[PDB]
Design a protein around this motif. Structure first.
Motif, PDB file in Angstrom:
ATOM      1  N   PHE A  68       0.929  -0.903   0.087  1.00  0.00           N
ATOM      2  CA  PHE A  68       0.138   0.537   0.040  1.00  0.00           C
ATOM      3  C   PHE A  68       0.838   1.072  -0.074  1.00  0.00           C
ATOM      4  O   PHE A  68       1.799   1.415   0.881  1.00  0.00           O
ATOM      5  CB  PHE A  68      -0.917  -0.294   1.217  1.00  0.00           C
ATOM      6  CG  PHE A  68      -1.887  -1.073   1.302  1.00  0.00           C
ATOM      7  CD1 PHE A  68      -3.163  -0.851   1.884  1.00  0.00           C
ATOM      8  CD2 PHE A  68      -2.037  -2.168   0.596  1.00  0.00           C
ATOM      9  CE1 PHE A  68      -4.333  -1.555   1.834  1.00  0.00           C
ATOM     10  CE2 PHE A  68      -3.583  -2.511   0.827  1.00  0.00           C
ATOM     11  CZ  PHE A  68      -4.080  -2.932   0.843  1.00  0.00           C
ATOM     12  N   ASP A  69       1.096   2.224  -0.805  1.00  0.00           N
ATOM     13  CA  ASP A  69       1.501   3.069  -1.221  1.00  0.00           C
ATOM     14  C   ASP A  69       1.113   4.050  -1.218  1.00  0.00           C
ATOM     15  O   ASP A  69      -0.026   4.795  -2.434  1.00  0.00           O
ATOM     16  CB  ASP A  69       2.640   2.754  -2.524  1.00  0.00           C
ATOM     17  CG  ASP A  69       2.947   3.756  -3.566  1.00  0.00           C
ATOM     18  OD1 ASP A  69       4.193   4.748  -1.800  1.00  0.00           O
ATOM     19  OD2 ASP A  69       3.822   3.447  -4.483  1.00  0.00           O
ATOM     20  N   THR A  70       1.307   5.398  -0.306  1.00  0.00           N
ATOM     21  CA  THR A  70       0.439   6.580  -0.326  1.00  0.00           C
ATOM     22  C   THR A  70       1.208   6.878  -1.174  1.00  0.00           C
ATOM     23  O   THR A  70       0.922   8.961  -1.590  1.00  0.00           O
ATOM     24  CB  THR A  70       0.121   6.718   0.819  1.00  0.00           C
ATOM     25  OG1 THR A  70       1.615   7.191   1.766  1.00  0.00           O
ATOM     26  CG2 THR A  70      -0.785   6.360   1.139  1.00  0.00           C
ATOM     27  N   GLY A  71       2.786   7.492  -1.837  1.00  0.00           N
ATOM     28  CA  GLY A  71       3.052   7.876  -2.659  1.00  0.00           C
ATOM     29  C   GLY A  71       3.184   8.035  -4.350  1.00  0.00           C
ATOM     30  O   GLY A  71       3.456   8.424  -4.840  1.00  0.00           O
ATOM     31  N   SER A  72       2.067   6.920  -4.450  1.00  0.00           N
ATOM     32  CA  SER A  72       1.172   6.553  -6.261  1.00  0.00           C
ATOM     33  C   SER A  72       0.129   6.097  -5.938  1.00  0.00           C
ATOM     34  O   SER A  72      -1.068   6.674  -4.981  1.00  0.00           O
ATOM     35  CB  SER A  72       2.390   5.329  -6.386  1.00  0.00           C
ATOM     36  OG  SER A  72       2.048   3.893  -6.098  1.00  0.00           O
ATOM     37  N   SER A  73      -0.376   5.911  -7.492  1.00  0.00           N
ATOM     38  CA  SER A  73      -1.987   5.621  -8.086  1.00  0.00           C
ATOM     39  C   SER A  73      -2.416   4.417  -8.524  1.00  0.00           C
ATOM     40  O   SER A  73      -3.164   5.243  -9.097  1.00  0.00           O
ATOM     41  CB  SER A  73      -2.375   7.484  -8.262  1.00  0.00           C
ATOM     42  OG  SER A  73      -1.860   8.415  -7.071  1.00  0.00           O
ATOM     43  N   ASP A  74      -1.657   3.920  -8.882  1.00  0.00           N
ATOM     44  CA  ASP A  74      -1.839   2.377  -9.347  1.00  0.00           C
ATOM     45  C   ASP A  74      -1.604   1.265  -8.838  1.00  0.00           C
ATOM     46  O   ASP A  74      -1.023   1.212  -7.732  1.00  0.00           O
ATOM     47  CB  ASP A  74      -0.574   2.538 -10.798  1.00  0.00           C
ATOM     48  CG  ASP A  74      -0.198   3.920 -11.515  1.00  0.00           C
ATOM     49  OD1 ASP A  74      -0.771   4.454 -11.175  1.00  0.00           O
ATOM     50  OD2 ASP A  74      -0.543   3.444 -12.983  1.00  0.00           O
ATOM     51  N   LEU A  75      -3.767   0.579  -9.085  1.00  0.00           N
ATOM     52  CA  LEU A  75      -3.071  -1.235  -8.436  1.00  0.00           C
ATOM     53  C   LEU A  75      -2.901  -1.584  -9.461  1.00  0.00           C
ATOM     54  O   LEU A  75      -2.895  -1.690 -10.379  1.00  0.00           O
ATOM     55  CB  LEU A  75      -4.793  -1.027  -8.157  1.00  0.00           C
ATOM     56  CG  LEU A  75      -4.685  -2.340  -7.045  1.00  0.00           C
ATOM     57  CD1 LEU A  75      -6.674  -1.783  -6.592  1.00  0.00           C
ATOM     58  CD2 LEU A  75      -4.446  -3.073  -7.696  1.00  0.00           C
ATOM     59  N   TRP A  76      -1.960  -2.163  -8.938  1.00  0.00           N
ATOM     60  CA  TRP A  76      -1.027  -2.844 -10.177  1.00  0.00           C
ATOM     61  C   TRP A  76      -0.683  -4.284  -9.393  1.00  0.00           C
ATOM     62  O   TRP A  76       0.193  -4.547  -8.251  1.00  0.00           O
ATOM     63  CB  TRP A  76       0.325  -2.029 -11.212  1.00  0.00           C
ATOM     64  CG  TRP A  76       1.536  -1.939 -10.476  1.00  0.00           C
ATOM     65  CD1 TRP A  76       2.190  -1.240  -9.819  1.00  0.00           C
ATOM     66  CD2 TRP A  76       2.862  -3.579  -9.902  1.00  0.00           C
ATOM     67  NE1 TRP A  76       3.353  -1.414  -9.417  1.00  0.00           N
ATOM     68  CE2 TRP A  76       3.772  -2.481  -9.679  1.00  0.00           C
ATOM     69  CE3 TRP A  76       2.534  -4.522 -10.665  1.00  0.00           C
ATOM     70  CZ2 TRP A  76       5.118  -3.331  -9.175  1.00  0.00           C
ATOM     71  CZ3 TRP A  76       3.909  -5.362 -10.393  1.00  0.00           C
ATOM     72  CH2 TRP A  76       4.458  -4.519 -10.011  1.00  0.00           C
ATOM     73  N   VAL A  77      -0.700  -6.001 -10.124  1.00  0.00           N
ATOM     74  CA  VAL A  77      -0.328  -7.191  -9.490  1.00  0.00           C
ATOM     75  C   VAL A  77       0.434  -7.739 -11.162  1.00  0.00           C
ATOM     76  O   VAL A  77       0.686  -7.696 -12.338  1.00  0.00           O
ATOM     77  CB  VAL A  77      -1.456  -7.582  -9.709  1.00  0.00           C
ATOM     78  CG1 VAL A  77      -2.279  -6.809  -8.544  1.00  0.00           C
ATOM     79  CG2 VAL A  77      -2.432  -7.664 -11.383  1.00  0.00           C
ATOM     80  N   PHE A  78       1.386  -7.896 -10.333  1.00  0.00           N
ATOM     81  CA  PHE A  78       2.133  -9.495 -11.029  1.00  0.00           C
ATOM     82  C   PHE A  78       0.661 -10.157 -11.681  1.00  0.00           C
ATOM     83  O   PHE A  78       0.219 -10.482 -10.533  1.00  0.00           O
ATOM     84  CB  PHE A  78       3.256 -10.307  -9.904  1.00  0.00           C
ATOM     85  CG  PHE A  78       4.116  -9.321  -9.749  1.00  0.00           C
ATOM     86  CD1 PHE A  78       4.596  -9.060  -9.326  1.00  0.00           C
ATOM     87  CD2 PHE A  78       5.602 -10.611 -10.528  1.00  0.00           C
ATOM     88  CE1 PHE A  78       6.034  -8.066  -9.112  1.00  0.00           C
ATOM     89  CE2 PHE A  78       6.668 -10.189 -10.604  1.00  0.00           C
ATOM     90  CZ  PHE A  78       6.659  -8.484  -9.435  1.00  0.00           C
TER      91      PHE A  78
ATOM     92  N   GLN B  41     -12.765  -1.587  -9.839  1.00  0.00           N
ATOM     93  CA  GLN B  41     -11.614  -1.539  -9.341  1.00  0.00           C
ATOM     94  C   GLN B  41     -11.024  -1.520 -11.258  1.00  0.00           C
ATOM     95  O   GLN B  41     -10.895  -2.720 -11.310  1.00  0.00           O
ATOM     96  CB  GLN B  41     -10.842  -1.607  -9.026  1.00  0.00           C
ATOM     97  CG  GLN B  41      -9.658  -1.345  -8.308  1.00  0.00           C
ATOM     98  CD  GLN B  41      -9.168   0.129  -8.043  1.00  0.00           C
ATOM     99  OE1 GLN B  41     -10.531   0.703  -7.073  1.00  0.00           O
ATOM    100  NE2 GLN B  41      -8.427   0.616  -7.989  1.00  0.00           N
ATOM    101  N   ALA B  42      -9.749  -0.489 -11.278  1.00  0.00           N
ATOM    102  CA  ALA B  42      -8.915  -1.087 -12.178  1.00  0.00           C
ATOM    103  C   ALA B  42      -7.821  -1.694 -11.377  1.00  0.00           C
ATOM    104  O   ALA B  42      -7.242  -0.822 -10.437  1.00  0.00           O
ATOM    105  CB  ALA B  42      -8.576   0.624 -13.190  1.00  0.00           C
ATOM    106  N   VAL B  43      -7.690  -3.328 -12.163  1.00  0.00           N
ATOM    107  CA  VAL B  43      -6.630  -3.514 -11.980  1.00  0.00           C
ATOM    108  C   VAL B  43      -5.477  -3.540 -12.913  1.00  0.00           C
ATOM    109  O   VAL B  43      -5.582  -4.496 -13.777  1.00  0.00           O
ATOM    110  CB  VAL B  43      -7.365  -5.223 -11.456  1.00  0.00           C
ATOM    111  CG1 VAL B  43      -6.123  -6.017 -11.416  1.00  0.00           C
ATOM    112  CG2 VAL B  43      -8.331  -4.716 -10.448  1.00  0.00           C
ATOM    113  N   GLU B  44      -4.421  -3.022 -12.683  1.00  0.00           N
ATOM    114  CA  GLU B  44      -3.209  -2.923 -13.959  1.00  0.00           C
ATOM    115  C   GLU B  44      -2.273  -4.111 -13.634  1.00  0.00           C
ATOM    116  O   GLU B  44      -1.903  -4.359 -13.097  1.00  0.00           O
ATOM    117  CB  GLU B  44      -2.643  -1.693 -14.089  1.00  0.00           C
ATOM    118  CG  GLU B  44      -3.880  -0.747 -13.595  1.00  0.00           C
ATOM    119  CD  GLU B  44      -2.407   1.012 -12.993  1.00  0.00           C
ATOM    120  OE1 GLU B  44      -3.873   1.219 -12.666  1.00  0.00           O
ATOM    121  OE2 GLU B  44      -1.293   1.015 -13.700  1.00  0.00           O
TER     122      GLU B  44
END
Length: 330
Positions: A34-44, A104-107
């Motif tokens: 969980f990253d409050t410094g970026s705005s993408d939800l991305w996964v392997f 939700q956008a899952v990248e």
């Protein structure tokens, strides 16, 4: 609605924290940073280049009955540490700690850089900065928090990171049992897409507090505390044998040292980082030179209140119409 999930350090140094996230139907649970410094939800994913996967759990959209390709959408991100990833995009159902967002956008990563491959414990990132930083093109996508906000009991999330121990991310409520004293709120600028705020000063150990404005970002996705060179020099001058090493890439100190605390100001309030939180251990296995947890921001362009600072506090990310940050001792 609300959600509550435990976040767990990935290693004995608290280099990062992972939180389980349910994606798809039936659920596929991945452990995300969980990253409050970026705005993408991305996964392997099942789409990630096979040579770039080394132990991570992958999202397989073809096994999710709720996954839908977001046609034409791509993403590509580079982080402050030089790492990167890129791919295409699905929408799917995503749940965190009981809180569910549909659509939700899952990248889905097609490529990840070596540092991601080499960290088998992190299955992707869940960005919690402002959605203006989201990298999806040609249609920018919203963060999980942005999508959940309207349904939450209160438009907030909180970070309660542990020192060498698990902690908690809560969505939609403030757990009044999780902190001591009162929460001090401070203004946020969203102009750069970050939870950007101005600290009112600092102290080193038992020294006097220096009143001075320090603009920086609250960034759960950065391990260390990055501050102006003047401040960092004043800190390490209090540690016998500490020095800045160009070959190592920052301040190092004798592992035999006892480190002083570091205090930062939030309005008239003060958050104390214990000295032990600033020890990141031997620079290489068996070395008696240890890496410091407070480093200069001079080469970054922004000051970063990373995990070293945030884990000393209960932190409220208030996503009301005018966002603010809150800090309490705990």
């Amino acid at each position: 609605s609300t959600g509550s999930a435990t976040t767990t350090p990935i290693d004995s140094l608290d280099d990062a924290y992972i939180t389980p996230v349910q994606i798809g139907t039936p659920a596929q649970t991945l452990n995300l940073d969980f990253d409050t410094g970026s705005s993408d939800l991305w996964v392997f994913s099942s789409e990630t280049t096979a040579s770039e996967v080394d132990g991570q759990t992958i999202y397989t959209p073809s096994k999710s009955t709720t996954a839908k390709l977001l046609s034409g959408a791509t993403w590509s991100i580079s982080y402050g540490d030089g790492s990167s990833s890129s791919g295409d995009v699905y929408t799917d159902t995503v749940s965190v700690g009981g809180l569910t967002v549909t659509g939700q956008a899952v990248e889905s990563a097609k490529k990840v850089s070596s540092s991601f491959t080499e960290d088998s414990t992190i299955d992707g990132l869940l960005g919690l900065a402002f959605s203006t930083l989201n990298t999806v093109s040609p249609t920018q996508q919203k963060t999980f928090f942005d999508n959940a906000k309207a349904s939450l009991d209160s438009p907030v999330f909180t970070a309660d990171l542990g020192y060498h121990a698990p902690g908690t991310y809560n969505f939609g409520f403030i757990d009044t049992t999780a902190y001591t004293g009162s929460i001090t709120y401070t203004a946020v600028s969203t102009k750069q897409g970050f939870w950007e705020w101005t600290s009112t000063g600092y102290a080193v150990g038992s020294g006097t507090f220096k009143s001075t404005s320090i603009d920086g970002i609250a960034d759960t996705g950065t391990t260390l505390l990055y501050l102006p060179a003047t401040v960092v020099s004043a800190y390490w001058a209090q540690v016998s044998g500490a020095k800045s090493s160009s070959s190592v890439g920052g301040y190092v100190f004798p592992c035999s040292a006892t480190l002083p605390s570091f205090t930062f100001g939030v309005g008239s309030a003060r958050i104390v980082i214990p000295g032990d939180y600033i020890d990141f251990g031997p620079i290489s296995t068996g070395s008696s030179s240890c890496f410091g947890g407070i480093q200069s921001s001079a080469g970054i362009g922004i000051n970063i209140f990373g995990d070293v600072a945030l884990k000393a506090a209960f932190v409220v990310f208030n996503g009301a119409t005018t966002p603010t940050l809150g800090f309490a001792s705990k």
